[PDB]
Curated annotation (Swiss-Prot), chains A, B:
Zn(2+) binds at E39. The gene is GRIN2B. It is linked to Intellectual developmental disorder, autosomal dominant 6, with or without seizures: A disorder characterized by significantly below average general intellectual functioning associated with impairments in adaptive behavior and manifested during the developmental period. MRD6 additional features may include seizures, hypotonia, abnormal movements, such as dystonia, and autistic features. Developmental and epileptic encephalopathy 27: A form of epileptic encephalopathy, a heterogeneous group of severe early-onset epilepsies characterized by refractory seizures, neurodevelopmental impairment, and poor prognosis. Development is normal prior to seizure onset, after which cognitive and motor delays become apparent. Phosphorylated on tyrosine residues. It comes from the Eukaryota. Heterotetramer. Forms heterotetrameric channels composed of two GluN1/zeta subunits (GRIN1), and two identical GluN2/epsilon subunits (GRIN2A, GRIN2B, GRIN2C or GRIN2D) or GluN3 subunits (GRIN3A or GRIN3B) (in vitro). Can also form heterotetrameric channels that contain at least two GluN1 subunits and at least two different GluN2 subunits (or a combination of one GluN2 and one GluN3 subunits) (in vitro). In vivo, the subunit composition may depend on the expression levels of the different subunits. Found in a complex with GRIN1 and GRIN3B. Found in a complex with GRIN1, GRIN3A and PPP2CB. This is Glutamate receptor ionotropic, NMDA 2B. Primarily found in the fronto-parieto-temporal cortex and hippocampus pyramidal cells, lower expression in the basal ganglia. The extracellular N-terminal domain (NTD) endows NMDARs with a unique capacity for allosteric modulation, harboring several binding sites for small molecule ligands that act as subunit-specific allosteric modulators of ion channel activity. It is found in: Cell membrane; Postsynaptic cell membrane; Cell projection, Dendrite; Late endosome. Belongs to the glutamate-gated ion channel (TC 1.A.10.1) family. NR2B/GRIN2B subfamily. Component of N-methyl-D-aspartate (NMDA) receptors (NMDARs) that function as heterotetrameric, ligand-gated cation channels with high calcium permeability and voltage-dependent block by Mg(2+). Participates in synaptic plasticity for learning and memory formation by contributing to the long-term depression (LTD) of hippocampus membrane currents. Channel activation requires binding of the neurotransmitter L-glutamate to the GluN2 subunit, glycine or D-serine binding to the GluN1 subunit, plus membrane depolarization to eliminate channel inhibition by Mg(2+).
């Protein structure tokens, strides 16, 4: 409604907001930065070993 | 929708927007400045003789 979501801004956000990275609510401005856990690399076989 | 209509701003406006000074659409920010003809002073008898 303000409209100053992203034009040169860089919103930085924790993994709580990102949640399931598959589902993006399309209201998140492009260029959002989040700090997620290594779900891509550490799969279940890797974590069970540890 | 931005909401930054008046907080320290000083909007200046011609008589066209002000229109009838008796009616205010309540969306005009407080502190709006407009230029208007001398309706208050130049009464109808004054304009007729002029």
């Amino acid at each position: 409604s303000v409209g100053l979501t992203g034009y040169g801004y860089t919103w930085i956000v924790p993994s709580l907001v990102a949640g399931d990275t598959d589902t993006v609510p399309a209201e998140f401005p492009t260029g959002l930065i989040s700090v997620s856990y290594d779900e891509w690399d550490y799969g279940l076989p890797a974590r069970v070993r540890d």
